[PDB]
């Protein structure tokens, strides 16, 4: 049978994983890095590509 | 002296409070209710107040 410590390990793990997922979600909403995937342009002197 | 359960109670409490604060932060960033505190207007026919 599972001891009390073995069960606590699983519950506390779930609580810290819940926290980790919430914190990741905060950081995405606030400061997720944004890729510049490409560029295009029309500029003077025929500068029509980057 | 404090038992193991009494100490676990305090640690698990901190983990669930950390989670609760993170979840509240998510809900603020995503869907915090916004008060309309006042209004003003200029509309036809001299309708210059709400």
């Amino acid at each position: 049978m599972v001891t009390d410590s073995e069960k606590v390990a699983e519950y506390l793990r779930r609580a810290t994983l819940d926290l980790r997922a919430a914190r990741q979600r905060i950081r995405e909403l606030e400061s997720d890095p944004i890729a510049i995937v490409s560029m295009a342009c029309r500029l003077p002197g025929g500068v029509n590509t980057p | 002296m404090v038992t193991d359960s009494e100490k676990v109670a305090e640690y698990l409490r901190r983990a669930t409070l950390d989670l609760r604060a993170a979840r509240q932060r998510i809900r603020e960033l995503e869907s915090d209710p916004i008060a309309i505190v006042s209004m003003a207007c200029r509309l036809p026919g001299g309708v210059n107040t709400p």
Epitope: V2, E6, K7, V8, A9, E10, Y11 | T3, L12
Partner: antibody
Framework: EVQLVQSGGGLVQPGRSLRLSCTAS????????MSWVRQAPGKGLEWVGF??????????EYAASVKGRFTISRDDSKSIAYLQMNSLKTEDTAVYYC?????????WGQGTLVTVSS | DVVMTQSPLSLPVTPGEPASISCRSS???????????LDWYLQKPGQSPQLLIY???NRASGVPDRFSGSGSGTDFTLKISRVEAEDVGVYYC??????????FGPGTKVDIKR
């Protein structure tokens, strides 16, 4: 994301053997106990057995109805849990679920139907 | 000395409206650490089980926040604030004081009120 992908079941005759697998992805498999739970057609969920993580000794426990016929093992390098089923009987017919956790079953495989029939 | 839980056999529900599932154990599930060792699971038809609530009142990440749990000792409730039609299936309250759990029991069959 967390995935538990089950395979290896199907039709089998009484007395024969099958090995079910549960292939995990998206978490550290080696940190979790893994459990098997089964559901005979139209019936409730019955606990089959489970295996502990290495952190708690890697040992197994089994329901009395399968003890001495079924064995659970794990491969932490491939992230697979196995259910080895020997001496299968018709009443073993069931959908077999693998689940993460030995006490808290917080993520479940999609299930594998095993039909024992001659 | 075996620890069992019982919940209602059936429970018709109405989408838009709340629902409550009660749970009673043969023995207090309150541990010295302050938590009740009672978890709630749901099996939707043709789907595998899923966790909803652990240690009485903690909602796992990704579970809709219309689900909550409460209670203590021997009496527990799963509450759905506003039922959705996708919430039909079998709900199980499972004690974790005594392991292993050999069965999930008959659970509470939730279906559409009419």
């Amino acid at each position: 994301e967390v995935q538990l992908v089950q395979s290896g079941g199907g039709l089998v005759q009484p007395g024969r053997s099958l090995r079910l697998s549960c292939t995990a992805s998206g978490f550290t498999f080696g940190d979790y106990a893994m459990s098997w739970v089964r559901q005979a057609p139209g019936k409730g969920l019955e606990w089959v057995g489970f295996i502990r993580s290495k952190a708690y000794g890697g040992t197994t426990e089994y329901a009395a109805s399968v003890k001495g016929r079924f064995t659970i093992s794990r491969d932490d390098s491939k992230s697979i849990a196995y259910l080895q089923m020997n001496s299968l009987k018709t009443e073993d017919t069931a959908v077999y679920y693998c689940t993460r956790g030995g006490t808290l079953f917080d993520y479940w495989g999609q299930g594998t139907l095993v039909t024992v029939s001659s | 000395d075996v620890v069992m839980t019982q919940s209602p056999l059936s429970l018709p529900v109405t989408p838009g409206e709340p629902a409550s599932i009660s749970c009673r154990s043969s023995q207090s599930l309150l541990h010295s650490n302050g938590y009740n060792y009672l978890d709630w699971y749901l099996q939707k038809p043709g789907q595998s089980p899923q966790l909803l609530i652990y240690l009485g009142s903690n909602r796992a990440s990704g579970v809709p926040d219309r689900f909550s749990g409460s209670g203590s000792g021997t009496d527990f409730t799963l509450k759905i604030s506003r039922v959705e039609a996708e919430d039909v299936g079998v709900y199980y309250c499972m004690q974790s004081l005594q392991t292993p759990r050999l069965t999930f029991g008959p659970g509470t069959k939730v279906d559409i009120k009419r």
